[PDB]
Design a protein around this nucleic acid. Structure first.
Length: 50
DNA sequence: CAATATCCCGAGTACATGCACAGGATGTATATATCTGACACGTGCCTGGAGACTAGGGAGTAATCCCCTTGGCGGTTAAAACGCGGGGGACAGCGCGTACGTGCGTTTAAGCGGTGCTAGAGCTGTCTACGACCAATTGAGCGGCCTCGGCA
């Protein structure tokens, strides 16, 4: 049974659709997995203010 | 006080939305990977501190009238409201582009070795530009000479 990384952060937003998005805006180099979990929850958190 | 207007409440009104569904593409999951760069280690520099002194500036004041500020000004239209015109609004279809799929083959990235371009070197080695001073010019205001208009 697969989990989802959204549940391990505790977030409603898609932590793995981000990551794949960031990996397309990246010079020629990679992106840490712990970036998607404070990339998200600093896009959610504008929702629930907007 | 009268009148035009905004506010408010209930009937009646399409479809919008939230949902359930099939299913597909991608997020996950595991194993592997090197290498980014974390971390650790000194190197050596400037950021900072700390003093003595002049001279530039800053702060202060004084005098004052410029400029702002105000009132009162006189003059003409945006607004008000109406009449009044045409124009923005709601349906029928064509086919052309856009998309999308196919197979189109151009070029880049990579790893190769060779080598010359550039960017840190100098006291380079000066000498443009940087003060320093002099000289010219114009303009403005103040005396001074000289015709004429209003008054004895």
């Amino acid at each position: 049974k697969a989990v989802s990384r959204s549940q391990r952060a505790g977030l409603q937003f898609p932590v793995g659709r981000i990551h794949r998005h960031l990996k397309s805006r990246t010079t020629s180099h990679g992106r840490v997995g712990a970036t998607a979990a404070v990339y998200s929850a600093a896009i959610l958190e504008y929702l629930t203010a907007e």
